[PDB]
Amino acid sequence: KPFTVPILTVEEMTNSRFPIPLEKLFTGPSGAFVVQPQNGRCTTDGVLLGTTQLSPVNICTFRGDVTHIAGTHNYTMNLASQNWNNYDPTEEIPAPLGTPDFVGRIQGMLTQTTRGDGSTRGHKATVSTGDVHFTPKLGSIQFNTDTNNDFETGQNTKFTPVGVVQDGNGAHQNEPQQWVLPSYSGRTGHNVHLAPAVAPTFPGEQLLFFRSTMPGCSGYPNMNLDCLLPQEWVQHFYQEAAPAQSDVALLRFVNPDTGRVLFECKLHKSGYVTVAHTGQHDLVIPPNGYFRFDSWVNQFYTLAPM
Amino acid sequence: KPFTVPILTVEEMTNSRFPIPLEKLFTGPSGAFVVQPQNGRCTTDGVLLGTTQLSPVNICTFRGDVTHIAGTHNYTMNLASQNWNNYDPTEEIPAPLGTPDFVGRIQGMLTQTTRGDGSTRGHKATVSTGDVHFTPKLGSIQFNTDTNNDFETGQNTKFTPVGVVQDGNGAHQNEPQQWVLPSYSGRTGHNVHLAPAVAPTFPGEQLLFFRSTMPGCSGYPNMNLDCLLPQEWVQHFYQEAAPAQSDVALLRFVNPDTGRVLFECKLHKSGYVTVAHTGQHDLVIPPNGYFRFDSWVNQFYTLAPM
Ligand SMILES: CC(=O)N[C@@H]1[C@@H](O[C@@H]2O[C@H](CO)[C@H](O)[C@H](O)[C@H]2O[C@@H]2O[C@@H](C)[C@@H](O)[C@@H](O)[C@@H]2O)[C@H](O[C@@H]2O[C@@H](C)[C@@H](O)[C@@H](O)[C@@H]2O)[C@@H](CO)O[C@H]1O
């Protein structure tokens, strides 16, 4: 089976780290950061890595039952799996699939149905993934909400993410921090089963990022969100399971109207893209442009400069 | 080019009428109501129909600029397209792409960024698709919110849907009404350019629906939501654009563990599925089962009983 990537254009695709569309392609130097996202991680032959799962809408959602923290507007959620089965904390994953992979405050809504009579309720809620109560690997997290009485125990409860918030007397755009992983077990333990950090290894190369702007809900948040693979590419590799014939697939980005190649890039078998460029750059592309697999090369292939 | 459907299982796929996962397959008699959804509509050779677009996360989202209605907590939104380009009310589509295709109250969050300084804000908000102000074909809708002063004019504003609500001392589960289309032009005009209504046309057949349960945010809503095609099938057909060799594709639903066919169904070229069954039925399926295209058949093919 021949390897392929989707022909969907960048704006026709979805960010793999938050449920929002892609907006653009971005390249920048990453030496100052550790680039180790856990969502949007998939090998080219369809092996999911880290906390990656297949659904574009389950990214950064949580499901489970909640318990009120008396005297506050906070609730603890005991997590269930994404299909309401028991959560298994012994699975060899860093955290439940789809768990956020950055430190920040995510605002959205908590919703609940009472199974007995079908009564429902929904409240604005925020989860702070850097807080000591954020322990998804252990099966528990905390939300700050807009009620101190409405949610019931023993009832299915869902968190739908919307955007990010920034608080404090800190500098503008100081949070979220998209390249800092939460501690999935809080302070009890270190992160386990992580998808590896990625970095360019060939001279003159940088990572190529698929970038979106997260909605902001309060303050002055850093809304940039970069993923290594579109979610639709994850679904595609997962289904095709095309075997890699070398360590690097050469892709060309093509304009369909003219047939002309705009740039070329390396898709590494372990699931990330590099380009030959130095410095921060928002790539200028035709709206109908798309990526096309052209051939198998090695890690020492010299790309045409972007 | 041979026709194929995705091998993703039902639980690995997304509802095409609301941004939530599929949960199950359902069949029932549909003679009493009109089955004319506008999202999740696509031919097998990849022509999108109705208000259908490619992104799972832009379903029931709105974008545009907002203006406050004095003396209230309501805002009018002047709609933009999903990539912030101007919306053209003269295109031969029923309403902007991704516009909700059922009458009900959809609750979510309105979020806004001030372009000049990166300040952000977000509020709970509801849009009632059956109300007199819901005129998305004409380019405007109204939101009910919990503020009367916070949103700014002339700034990009996004609505992220979360769930549905039901109000009043009315009968439980009376709304939403998933098979009643909004009037996209309100009372000024009638709906146009709709994807056709669908019905079984062969004796003993019923529609097969891909079913989800919408989150409920208030009251006693009817949370069932049936789509004709999973969103991933829409993206797949759009990309492949395989020619239809007859009006009916025979699909088999297969258990990969045993290799045995569980049931068969007809995928019609114009984009919906039928099965041979009479009565309301929640299909019981193995979690790893999937659809497989087997052959093009003629108009006289009789399906094996489901
Ligand atoms: C606390 C509670 O259950 N309240 C009931 C109330 O329902 C609340 O109505 C107010 C409007 O004043 C808000 O819409 C609340 O969101 C709503 O509470 C929601 O819905 C109820 C049924 C529960 O599921 C709750 O968990 C959830 O937060 C209700 O008012 C009636 O029903 C509501 C939904 C609305 O349609 C009203 O117009 C209507 O009078 C009353 C009477 O049924 O009962 C209260 O106990």
PDB file of C-alpha atoms in Angstrom, chain B residues 68-207:
ATOM      1  CA  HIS B  68     -25.745  45.326  21.577  1.00  0.00           C
ATOM      2  CA  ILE B  69     -29.536  45.721  21.709  1.00  0.00           C
ATOM      3  CA  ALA B  70     -30.261  48.577  24.135  1.00  0.00           C
ATOM      4  CA  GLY B  71     -32.252  47.682  27.281  1.00  0.00           C
ATOM      5  CA  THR B  72     -31.501  43.966  27.000  1.00  0.00           C
ATOM      6  CA  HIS B  73     -28.858  41.303  27.356  1.00  0.00           C
ATOM      7  CA  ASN B  74     -29.112  40.547  23.599  1.00  0.00           C
ATOM      8  CA  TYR B  75     -26.722  41.010  20.703  1.00  0.00           C
ATOM      9  CA  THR B  76     -27.162  40.976  16.966  1.00  0.00           C
ATOM     10  CA  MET B  77     -24.393  39.233  15.033  1.00  0.00           C
ATOM     11  CA  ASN B  78     -23.673  40.219  11.455  1.00  0.00           C
ATOM     12  CA  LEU B  79     -22.305  37.032  10.015  1.00  0.00           C
ATOM     13  CA  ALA B  80     -19.008  36.465   8.309  1.00  0.00           C
ATOM     14  CA  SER B  81     -17.979  33.284   6.501  1.00  0.00           C
ATOM     15  CA  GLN B  82     -16.149  30.623   8.542  1.00  0.00           C
ATOM     16  CA  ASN B  83     -12.742  32.043   7.537  1.00  0.00           C
ATOM     17  CA  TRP B  84     -13.802  35.673   8.216  1.00  0.00           C
ATOM     18  CA  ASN B  85     -14.382  36.570   4.576  1.00  0.00           C
ATOM     19  CA  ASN B  86     -17.598  38.479   3.794  1.00  0.00           C
ATOM     20  CA  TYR B  87     -20.783  36.409   3.681  1.00  0.00           C
ATOM     21  CA  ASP B  88     -22.702  36.603   0.355  1.00  0.00           C
ATOM     22  CA  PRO B  89     -26.467  36.256   0.807  1.00  0.00           C
ATOM     23  CA  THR B  90     -26.862  35.619  -2.955  1.00  0.00           C
ATOM     24  CA  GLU B  91     -24.907  32.322  -3.205  1.00  0.00           C
ATOM     25  CA  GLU B  92     -27.200  29.378  -3.990  1.00  0.00           C
ATOM     26  CA  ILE B  93     -26.952  27.823  -0.553  1.00  0.00           C
ATOM     27  CA  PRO B  94     -29.719  27.779   2.049  1.00  0.00           C
ATOM     28  CA  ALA B  95     -27.735  29.637   4.693  1.00  0.00           C
ATOM     29  CA  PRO B  96     -24.088  30.087   5.688  1.00  0.00           C
ATOM     30  CA  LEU B  97     -22.176  26.754   5.719  1.00  0.00           C
ATOM     31  CA  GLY B  98     -22.467  24.926   9.044  1.00  0.00           C
ATOM     32  CA  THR B  99     -25.651  26.800  10.102  1.00  0.00           C
ATOM     33  CA  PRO B 100     -27.734  24.610  12.460  1.00  0.00           C
ATOM     34  CA  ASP B 101     -30.369  22.564  10.600  1.00  0.00           C
ATOM     35  CA  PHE B 102     -32.888  22.066  13.388  1.00  0.00           C
ATOM     36  CA  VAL B 103     -35.252  24.316  15.383  1.00  0.00           C
ATOM     37  CA  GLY B 104     -34.085  24.642  18.961  1.00  0.00           C
ATOM     38  CA  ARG B 105     -32.154  26.664  21.467  1.00  0.00           C
ATOM     39  CA  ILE B 106     -28.438  26.099  21.283  1.00  0.00           C
ATOM     40  CA  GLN B 107     -26.352  27.239  24.209  1.00  0.00           C
ATOM     41  CA  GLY B 108     -22.641  27.869  24.116  1.00  0.00           C
ATOM     42  CA  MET B 109     -20.159  30.652  24.526  1.00  0.00           C
ATOM     43  CA  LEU B 110     -19.588  33.902  22.641  1.00  0.00           C
ATOM     44  CA  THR B 111     -15.913  34.889  22.676  1.00  0.00           C
ATOM     45  CA  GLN B 112     -14.200  37.945  21.413  1.00  0.00           C
ATOM     46  CA  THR B 113     -10.688  39.319  20.950  1.00  0.00           C
ATOM     47  CA  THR B 114      -9.858  43.053  20.636  1.00  0.00           C
ATOM     48  CA  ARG B 115      -7.479  43.150  17.668  1.00  0.00           C
ATOM     49  CA  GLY B 116      -5.640  46.235  18.911  1.00  0.00           C
ATOM     50  CA  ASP B 117      -4.390  44.978  22.307  1.00  0.00           C
ATOM     51  CA  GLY B 118      -5.185  41.266  22.512  1.00  0.00           C
ATOM     52  CA  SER B 119      -7.706  41.699  25.338  1.00  0.00           C
ATOM     53  CA  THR B 120     -10.328  38.907  25.393  1.00  0.00           C
ATOM     54  CA  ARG B 121     -13.737  38.174  26.865  1.00  0.00           C
ATOM     55  CA  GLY B 122     -16.262  35.364  26.909  1.00  0.00           C
ATOM     56  CA  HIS B 123     -19.865  34.892  27.971  1.00  0.00           C
ATOM     57  CA  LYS B 124     -22.491  32.178  28.026  1.00  0.00           C
ATOM     58  CA  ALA B 125     -24.933  32.755  25.174  1.00  0.00           C
ATOM     59  CA  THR B 126     -27.943  31.109  23.525  1.00  0.00           C
ATOM     60  CA  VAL B 127     -29.261  31.217  19.983  1.00  0.00           C
ATOM     61  CA  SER B 128     -32.836  30.193  19.330  1.00  0.00           C
ATOM     62  CA  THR B 129     -32.999  28.928  15.710  1.00  0.00           C
ATOM     63  CA  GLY B 130     -36.791  29.084  15.729  1.00  0.00           C
ATOM     64  CA  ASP B 131     -37.031  32.733  16.864  1.00  0.00           C
ATOM     65  CA  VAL B 132     -38.108  35.719  14.734  1.00  0.00           C
ATOM     66  CA  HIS B 133     -34.552  37.149  14.730  1.00  0.00           C
ATOM     67  CA  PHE B 134     -32.856  34.018  13.302  1.00  0.00           C
ATOM     68  CA  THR B 135     -32.176  35.128   9.722  1.00  0.00           C
ATOM     69  CA  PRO B 136     -28.764  33.593   8.896  1.00  0.00           C
ATOM     70  CA  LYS B 137     -29.506  33.460   5.142  1.00  0.00           C
ATOM     71  CA  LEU B 138     -29.891  37.244   5.286  1.00  0.00           C
ATOM     72  CA  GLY B 139     -26.732  37.492   7.365  1.00  0.00           C
ATOM     73  CA  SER B 140     -27.931  38.134  10.912  1.00  0.00           C
ATOM     74  CA  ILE B 141     -28.893  36.251  14.057  1.00  0.00           C
ATOM     75  CA  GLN B 142     -29.497  37.254  17.612  1.00  0.00           C
ATOM     76  CA  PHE B 143     -27.888  35.979  20.800  1.00  0.00           C
ATOM     77  CA  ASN B 144     -29.204  36.063  24.297  1.00  0.00           C
ATOM     78  CA  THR B 145     -26.370  36.488  26.851  1.00  0.00           C
ATOM     79  CA  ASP B 146     -25.652  37.407  30.491  1.00  0.00           C
ATOM     80  CA  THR B 147     -24.081  40.800  29.701  1.00  0.00           C
ATOM     81  CA  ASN B 148     -25.384  44.147  28.472  1.00  0.00           C
ATOM     82  CA  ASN B 149     -22.086  45.971  28.018  1.00  0.00           C
ATOM     83  CA  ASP B 150     -19.026  43.754  27.750  1.00  0.00           C
ATOM     84  CA  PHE B 151     -18.799  42.924  23.993  1.00  0.00           C
ATOM     85  CA  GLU B 152     -17.219  45.518  21.697  1.00  0.00           C
ATOM     86  CA  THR B 153     -18.372  46.542  18.193  1.00  0.00           C
ATOM     87  CA  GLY B 154     -16.210  46.025  15.103  1.00  0.00           C
ATOM     88  CA  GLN B 155     -14.404  43.020  16.569  1.00  0.00           C
ATOM     89  CA  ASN B 156     -14.282  39.359  15.566  1.00  0.00           C
ATOM     90  CA  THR B 157     -16.745  37.395  17.681  1.00  0.00           C
ATOM     91  CA  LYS B 158     -17.189  33.620  17.648  1.00  0.00           C
ATOM     92  CA  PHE B 159     -19.968  31.353  18.942  1.00  0.00           C
ATOM     93  CA  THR B 160     -18.918  27.928  20.063  1.00  0.00           C
ATOM     94  CA  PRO B 161     -21.841  25.538  20.509  1.00  0.00           C
ATOM     95  CA  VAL B 162     -22.032  23.269  23.529  1.00  0.00           C
ATOM     96  CA  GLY B 163     -25.580  21.891  23.907  1.00  0.00           C
ATOM     97  CA  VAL B 164     -29.321  22.463  23.740  1.00  0.00           C
ATOM     98  CA  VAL B 165     -31.919  23.782  26.168  1.00  0.00           C
ATOM     99  CA  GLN B 166     -35.642  23.352  26.717  1.00  0.00           C
ATOM    100  CA  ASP B 167     -37.874  25.928  28.394  1.00  0.00           C
ATOM    101  CA  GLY B 168     -41.312  26.419  29.890  1.00  0.00           C
ATOM    102  CA  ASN B 169     -44.039  24.437  31.587  1.00  0.00           C
ATOM    103  CA  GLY B 170     -44.322  22.818  28.174  1.00  0.00           C
ATOM    104  CA  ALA B 171     -44.266  19.090  27.689  1.00  0.00           C
ATOM    105  CA  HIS B 172     -40.884  17.487  28.328  1.00  0.00           C
ATOM    106  CA  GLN B 173     -38.637  16.839  25.279  1.00  0.00           C
ATOM    107  CA  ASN B 174     -40.715  19.121  23.088  1.00  0.00           C
ATOM    108  CA  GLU B 175     -37.530  20.849  21.809  1.00  0.00           C
ATOM    109  CA  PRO B 176     -35.295  20.727  19.981  1.00  0.00           C
ATOM    110  CA  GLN B 177     -37.071  19.437  16.909  1.00  0.00           C
ATOM    111  CA  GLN B 178     -34.352  17.768  14.922  1.00  0.00           C
ATOM    112  CA  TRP B 179     -36.454  17.229  11.805  1.00  0.00           C
ATOM    113  CA  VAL B 180     -37.832  20.757  11.485  1.00  0.00           C
ATOM    114  CA  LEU B 181     -35.561  23.113   9.597  1.00  0.00           C
ATOM    115  CA  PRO B 182     -35.266  26.677  10.763  1.00  0.00           C
ATOM    116  CA  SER B 183     -36.648  29.298   8.474  1.00  0.00           C
ATOM    117  CA  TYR B 184     -33.281  30.606   7.345  1.00  0.00           C
ATOM    118  CA  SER B 185     -34.742  33.933   6.182  1.00  0.00           C
ATOM    119  CA  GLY B 186     -37.159  34.227   9.132  1.00  0.00           C
ATOM    120  CA  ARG B 187     -40.627  35.320   8.035  1.00  0.00           C
ATOM    121  CA  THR B 188     -39.447  37.492   5.056  1.00  0.00           C
ATOM    122  CA  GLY B 189     -38.993  34.475   2.804  1.00  0.00           C
ATOM    123  CA  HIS B 190     -39.012  30.750   2.239  1.00  0.00           C
ATOM    124  CA  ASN B 191     -36.127  28.239   2.428  1.00  0.00           C
ATOM    125  CA  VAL B 192     -34.285  27.668  -0.820  1.00  0.00           C
ATOM    126  CA  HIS B 193     -31.505  25.546  -2.286  1.00  0.00           C
ATOM    127  CA  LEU B 194     -32.100  22.716   0.183  1.00  0.00           C
ATOM    128  CA  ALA B 195     -30.655  19.281   0.019  1.00  0.00           C
ATOM    129  CA  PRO B 196     -33.509  16.933  -0.863  1.00  0.00           C
ATOM    130  CA  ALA B 197     -35.672  15.134   1.686  1.00  0.00           C
ATOM    131  CA  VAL B 198     -34.796  11.421   1.953  1.00  0.00           C
ATOM    132  CA  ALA B 199     -37.027   8.414   2.352  1.00  0.00           C
ATOM    133  CA  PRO B 200     -36.891   4.684   1.870  1.00  0.00           C
ATOM    134  CA  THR B 201     -38.349   3.767  -1.575  1.00  0.00           C
ATOM    135  CA  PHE B 202     -38.050  -0.022  -1.472  1.00  0.00           C
ATOM    136  CA  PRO B 203     -40.501  -2.304   0.322  1.00  0.00           C
ATOM    137  CA  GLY B 204     -39.360  -3.250   3.861  1.00  0.00           C
ATOM    138  CA  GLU B 205     -36.544  -0.682   4.023  1.00  0.00           C
ATOM    139  CA  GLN B 206     -35.892   2.036   6.581  1.00  0.00           C
ATOM    140  CA  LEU B 207     -33.289   4.777   6.865  1.00  0.00           C
TER     141      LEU B 207
END
